Amino acid sequence: ESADLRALAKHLYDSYIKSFPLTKAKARAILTGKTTDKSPFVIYDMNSLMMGEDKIKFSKEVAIRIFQGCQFRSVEAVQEITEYAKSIPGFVNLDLNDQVTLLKYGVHEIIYTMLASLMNKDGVLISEGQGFMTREFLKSLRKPFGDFMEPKFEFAVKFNALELDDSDLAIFIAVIILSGDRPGLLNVKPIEDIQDNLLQALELQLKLNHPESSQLFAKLLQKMTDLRQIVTEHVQLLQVIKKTETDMSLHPLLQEIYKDL
């Protein structure tokens, strides 16, 4: 019955809002500076970056500070995602070692999915939207850290072209966690039973919310290829900073879900 799917769709969107402080709705409202009830401070070089603290709650180089921000932002999102994931029906019932494995492997694909909500083609919101750092300022950093964000902007523009809203994303990111082809899953079939369910919810949720978009379902499922390549590119980048920056700490949670290859 499609009516139970809808009850599932509503439950997830509700836990989504409850787990993530900055929705896509709030982000698009900040970004279209026609809604100027709260406008972002814009960082665009190092001058802007320095004044961004006379204004915003924010000798140790800048590209690394930039990056250990992106680091501890990633910690932030992982804890919001694991909280969101507990709320997915059946997920907390699963073998504990497999809870950990869906999370290990689904979380980064989910940071970059949601990173798109914060993104347009010129930059990305910062500190839960108070600030907005340009895409070029990012591109300009010290020669290694000078391109880590660049494949996110690449995916985000093409992903944001589908124009999903949060009530669509909440079901999509659930599908991502509940994959079943993650490495090392002891019992995968109950995982596939839940995802069959999430897929059905997602399919009819897109069908009802975007009824002029033939096969948005097929086209949204394809973008899962782009997340996998973002994650690999990122882990490769990550290793170069390790060696060419032996003074560069990394958070052990991030360090923990990063078991490479």
Ligand X SMILES: CC1(COc2ccc(CC3=[SH]C(=O)NC3=O)cc2)CCCCC1
Q: Locate tokens 């900073």: which residue?
A: 241
110 binds ligand X (CB under 6 A): no
C-alpha triplet 212, 173, 146: angle, nearest 5°: 100
Contacts within 8 Å (CB) and 24+ apart, 49-57 = 49/137, 52/131, 55/131, 56/126, 56/127, 56/130, 56/131, 57/127, 57/130
65 binds ligand X (CB under 6 A): yes
Task: Indicate the burial class of 237 (C-beta count within 10 angstroms; 0-12, 13-18, 19 or more).
Answer: middle
127 binds ligand X (CB under 6 A): yes
Identify the CA nearest to 257 among candidates 231, 224, 237: 231
Tokens standing for residue 132: 């907005």
89 binds ligand X (CB under 6 A): no
CB of 19 to ligand X, least distance (A): 18
Residue 68 CB neighbour total at 10 angstroms: 14
Span near ligand X by CB under 6 A; candidates 126-134, 175-183, 190-198, 210-218: 126-134
CB of 96 to ligand X, least distance (A): 30
126 binds ligand X (CB under 6 A): yes
Among 22, 69, 144, 157, binds ligand X (CB under 6 A): 69
Amino acid at 84: Y
194 binds ligand X (CB under 6 A): no
Tokens standing for residue 113: 């999915």
Tokens standing for residue 250: 């990394």
Among 58, 162, 200, 224, binds ligand X (CB under 6 A): 58
Q: Is 105 annotated as a binding residue?
A: no
CB of 243 to ligand X, least distance (A): 22
Judged by CB under 6 A, the chain residues 138 through 157 that form the site for ligand X are 149
Coil/strand/helix, residue 247: coil
184 binds ligand X (CB under 6 A): no
Laid out side by side, the sheet with 131-134 consists of 41-43, 131-134, 123-126, 119-120
124 binds ligand X (CB under 6 A): yes
Among 8, 70, 176, 201, binds ligand X (CB under 6 A): 70
Whether 258 and 241 have beta carbons less than 8 Å apart is answered as: no
CB of 75 to ligand X, least distance (A): 10
Among 6, 10, 28, 73, binds ligand X (CB under 6 A): 73
Under the rule (CB under 6 A), what is the footprint of ligand X? 58, 65, 69-70, 72-73, 124, 126-127, 133, 149
